[PDB]
Design a binder for this molecule. Structure first.
Ligand SMILES: CC(C)(C)c1nc(-c2cccc(NS(=O)(=O)c3c(F)cccc3F)c2F)c(-c2ccnc(N)n2)s1
Length: 270
């Protein structure tokens, strides 16, 4: 069983998630849509995603967008993705701010922790709207569908393999929100000062997750689930570092980051 404190911890996380995760994306509006050796790398960077976009109007109409092939056209999706990322990042910041364990840290460590983890928490939330059968992220009236190598070739992209592998674990809402907490409270992000406090908090969240899995998932399929989840969080941190470098290269060639994104990625405006 869980202790009273562990149940309180989960309930506080679940409450924060429900208050700040707009799962239907109803308040995502007014977003933009698609109308030397540095460049080869930036081309390789931009070619790894490849999603088409679908927008279902409230009246029943459907707009569909199919991206081009790399023949400047590789940048046509960046303003839209910047708007989606900014919307998600806002939700993530709200999440952190309604959690008492986070509100209790000094403001400087709050900022450091958010800068370190915003990408990761975004990816964790996107996994809950990922449909692994159709290869699509279902964000309310918006859908992002992976373009057609096959599934095996898709799994070569680490973010995509991450989404398929994590979806396969069939986690509960409580396990997702504890993964978000373990990621947010990482004592080893640059600029963290209360390293010991954050480390103890993280360990508590991880113990709560371990005990929750033990008390509620006895089936042979969920043997080692806790260790699988922690390995996924390690892999997600790696993905975060490579995507940060990728974003900074693209931003160096073709600026696109919003002010919130610039703040989170350490871009100063100078
Ligand atoms: C909706 C769906 C299909 C799940 C996506 N989410 C992101 C995504 C996920 C998390 C954060 C950001 N924004 S971001 O700021 O983290 C960032 C970029 F917007 C662009 C490049 C790297 C990067 F880290 C994203 F764009 C996608 C995405 C698109 C292009 N590049 C990258 N790295 N991610 S695709």
């Amino acid at each position: 069983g869980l202790t009273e404190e562990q149940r309180m911890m989960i309930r506080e996380l679940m409450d924060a998630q429900m208050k700040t995760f707009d799962t239907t994306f109803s308040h995502f509006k007014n977003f933009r849509l698609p109308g030397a050796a540095k460049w080869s790398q930036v081309r390789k960077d931009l070619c790894s995603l490849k999603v088409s976009l679908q927008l279902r109007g409230e009246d029943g109409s459907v707009w569909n967008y199919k991206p081009p092939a790399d023949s400047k056209e590789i940048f046509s999706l960046l303003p839209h993705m910047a708007d989606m990322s900014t919307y998600m990042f806002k939700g993530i910041i709200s999440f952190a701010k309604v959690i008492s364990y986070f509100r209790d840290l000094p403001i400087e460590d709050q900022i450091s922790l958010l800068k370190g983890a915003a990408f990761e928490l975004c990816q964790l939330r996107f996994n809950t709207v990922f449909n692994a059968e159709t290869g699509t992220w279902e964000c309310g009236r918006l859908s992002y569908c992976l373009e057609d190598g096959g599934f095996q070739q898709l799994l070569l992209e680490p973010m995509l393999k991450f989404h398929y592998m994590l979806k396969k674990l069939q986690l509960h809402e409580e396990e997702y929100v504890l993964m978000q907490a373990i990621s947010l409270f990482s004592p080893d992000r640059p600029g963290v000062l209360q390293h010991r406090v954050v480390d103890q908090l993280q360990e508590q969240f991880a113990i709560t997750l371990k005990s929750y899995i033990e008390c509620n998932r006895p089936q042979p399929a969920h043997r080692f689930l806790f260790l699988k989840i922690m390995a996924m969080l390690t892999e997600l941190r790696s993905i975060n570092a490579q995507h940060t470098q990728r974003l900074l290269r693209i931003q160096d060639i073709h600026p696109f980051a919003t002010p919130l994104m610039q703040e989170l990625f350490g871009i100063t405006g100078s």
